[PDB]
């Protein structure tokens, strides 16, 4: 049931999140996942507030409720992390 | 530095090899 629930939603894509120090963490998300969950996980692993960071896709700000589908993201796409302005 | 893959579960985030 859980397995059939998962596959209806499709596959995970694997994104690479590149930090200010050029370190890298990959995240798997589904195409309809809100990226706030990625932003929060990344911030949590870096020890900093989420709102101290801005997350860009091809230079565009990623909103909390953006999804990979909305952004046109694909397997192996990159998210860049910068300090909030 | 070792490879790091985090699964955003939304849903079992344990297995980062997963694709569904
Ligand atoms: Zn890949
Ligand atoms: Zn691309
Ligand atoms: Zn890697
Ligand atoms: Zn599931």
Q: Which two tokens stand for residue A19?
A: 């930090």
H/E run at residue A10: none
| CB of A14 closer than 8 Å to CB of A68 | no
Query: Which of A12, A43, A44 best tests the B interface by mutation, with the highest count of B CBs <10 A?
Result: A12
Q: How many domains does chain A have?
A: 1
Mark B1-20 as b/e (b = at least 16 C-beta within 10 Å).
Answer: eeeeebbbeeeeeeeeeeee
| CB of A8 closer than 8 Å to CB of B20 | no
**DSSP summary character for residue A11:** P
Q: Tell me how long chain A is.
A: 85
| CB of A79 closer than 8 Å to CB of A57 | yes
Q: Collapsing DSSP states into helix, strand and coil, what is residue A7?
A: helix
φ and ψ of A69, to 5 deg:
-60, -50
* Resolution (Å units): 1.8
Distance CA A17, CA A39 (A): 10
CATH number at residue A23: 3.10.20.90
DSSP labels, A15-83: EEEE-TTS-EEEEEE-TT--THHHHHHHHHHHTS-GGGEEEEETTEEPPTT--HHHHT--TT-EEEEEE
First to last CA, chain A: 45
Sign of the Cα pseudo-torsion (A84, B2, B3, B6, in order)? negative
| Closest chain B residue to the Cα of A35, Cα to Cα | B8
- Enumerate the residues of chain B whose CB falls inside 8 A of the CB of residue A81: none
Query: Which of A3, A18, A28 best tests the B interface by mutation, with the highest count of B CBs <10 A?
Result: A28
Q: How was this structure determined?
A: X-ray
Which strands, in side-by-side order, build the sheet including A13-18? Answer: A60-61, A53-57, A78-83, A13-18, A24-29, B5-7
Structural domain range at position A7: 1-83
């Amino acid at each position: 049931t859980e397995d059939l629930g998962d596959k209806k939603e499709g596959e995970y894509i694997k994104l690479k999140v590149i930090g200010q120090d050029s370190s890298e963490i990959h995240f798997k998300v589904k195409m309809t996942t809100h990226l706030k969950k990625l932003k929060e996980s990344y911030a949590q692993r870096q020890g900093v507030p989420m709102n101290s960071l801005r997350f860009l896709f091809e230079g565009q700000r990623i909103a909390d409720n953006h999804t990979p589908k909305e952004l046109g993201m694909e397997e192996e796409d990159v998210i860049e992390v910068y300090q909030e302005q | 530095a070792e490879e790091r893959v985090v699964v955003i579960d939304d849903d079992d985030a344990e297995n980062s090899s997963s694709r569904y």
